[PDB]
Paper text:
One system that would benefit immensely from an improved mechanistic understanding of allostery is the archetypal protein tyrosine phosphatase, [name] (also known as [name]). [name] is highly validated as a therapeutic target for diabetes and cancer and has also been linked to Rett syndrome. Transition of this loop from the open to the closed state is rate-limiting for catalysis. By exploiting a new multitemperature multiconformer X-ray approach, we have identified a collective allosteric network that is contiguous on the ‘back side’ of the protein, centered around the quasi-ordered α7 helix.
However, low-contour electron density can reveal hidden [name] conformations in protein crystal structures. We therefore investigated the electron density near the WPD loop in the apo structure more closely. Surprisingly, upon closer inspection, the electron density strongly suggests a significant population for the open state as well (left). Our re-refined model with both open and closed states as [name] conformations visually accounts for the electron density around this loop much better than the original model (left). By contrast, when we re-refined 36 other available crystal structures of [name] complexed with active-site inhibitors using both open and closed loop states as putative [name] conformations, Fo-Fc difference electron density and the bimodal distribution of refined occupancies indicated the single-state models were a better fit. These results suggest that, even in the crystal, apo [name] samples both WPD loop states and that active-site inhibitors then lock the loop either fully open or fully closed. To better characterize the conformational heterogeneity of the WPD loop in apo [name], we collected X-ray datasets at several elevated temperatures including 180 K, 240 K, and 278 K (‘room temperature’) in addition to the 100 K (‘cryogenic’) model from the [name], all at better than 2 Å resolution. We built an initial multiconformer model for each temperature using the automated algorithm qFit. These models are parsimonious in that each atom has [name] positions only if justified by the experimental data, and a single position otherwise. The WPD loop adopts both the open and closed conformations across this range and the population of the open vs. closed states was sensitive to temperature. The loop is approximately 67% closed at 100 K, but 65% open at 278 K. These occupancies evolve non-linearly at intermediate temperatures.
Numbering used by the authors: 2 to 299
The structure:
């Protein structure tokens, strides 16, 4: 049971060992497509690649490769697409994927610039009147509205397939205070954001999988998806004790390497699930407490 395991691990100071155990047990599958010479400039990081078996394929015959993985959680009945922060040459690919996979939401957990370096291309428009056209994939993207909070912003975007002139509304959930290789400022602040995404419908089964990314698409992105899946499993059976966080994480790592990049992100994942369990197990008021503690206004 996770709350007792947490205290035992905290007490023995063994988060690094638990986390290394996860790394050692984690799946290893081939990433041959990601490593083809022609895809070199489609990967942001040499040591973060999608597995062939779970990679998202673009529906184009030129080159279907994007650094993106489908994390299909069968028992939880939720899917996520985890991807790297788009590169200056893959922003068209990114929105092609969103279009083809029928996603409603994009969850961005990084800033464009972190630690003085560029982690992500500016892949969405920042001004309503300056829309973006991705000529290679023939898509148009317009900023419709934004709702800026103290540590996250929600944007309403309109994505248009210029070939057919079909349009879709995409919601962009941008977490702006979560450091690279770091953790959110509090469980309450993480959970407030996650439940904002949930409320939007972006994680729901009538849409394609939510697209989640940070810079590499494994650390913060893994923490977000791990917490979400654990809370959903707990919700399905109202049985917190039946949820084994580490096993869930190992399951997720069958679909993309390296999910959860530090032992402190693992520890934070436990904290977030433990605190989220209060809401799942019937204390609806805790959602308002998180919003208060998160100080989202201003």
């Amino acid at each position: 049971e996770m709350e007792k395991e947490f205290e035992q691990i905290d007490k023995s100071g063994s988060w690094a060992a638990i986390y290394q155990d996860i790394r050692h047990e984690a799946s290893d599958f081939p990433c041959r497509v990601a490593k083809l010479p022609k895809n070199k400039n489609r990967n942001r990081y040499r040591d973060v690649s999608p597995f062939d078996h779970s990679r998202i394929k673009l529906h184009q015959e030129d080159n279907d490769y994007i650094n993106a993985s489908l994390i299909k959680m069968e028992e939880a009945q939720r899917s996520y697409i985890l991807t790297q922060g788009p590169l200056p040459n893959t922003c068209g690919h990114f929105w092609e994927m969103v279009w083809e996979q029928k996603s409603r939401g994009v969850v961005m957990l990084n800033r464009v610039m972190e630690k003085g370096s560029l982690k992500c291309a500016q892949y969405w428009p920042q001004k309503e009147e300056k829309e973006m056209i991705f000529e290679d994939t023939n898509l148009k993207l317009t900023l419709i509205s934004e709702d800026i909070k103290s540590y996250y912003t929600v944007r309403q975007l309109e994505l248009e397939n210029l070939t057919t002139q079909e349009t879709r509304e995409i919601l962009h959930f941008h977490y702006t205070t979560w450091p690279d290789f770091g953790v959110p400022e509090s469980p309450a602040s993480f959970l407030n954001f996650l439940f904002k995404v949930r409320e939007s419908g972006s994680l729901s089964p009538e849409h394609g999988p939510v697209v989640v990314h940070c810079s590499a698409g494994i650390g913060r992105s893994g923490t977000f998806c791990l917490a979400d899946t654990c809370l959903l499993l707990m919700d399905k059976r109202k049985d917190p004790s039946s949820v084994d966080i580490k096993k869930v994480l190992l399951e997720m790592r069958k679909f993309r390497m390296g999910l959860i990049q530090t032992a402190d992100q693992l520890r934070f994942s436990y904290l977030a699930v433990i605190e989220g369990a209060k809401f799942i197990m019937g204390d609806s008021s805790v959602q308002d407490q998180w919003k208060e503690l998160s100080h989202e206004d201003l």
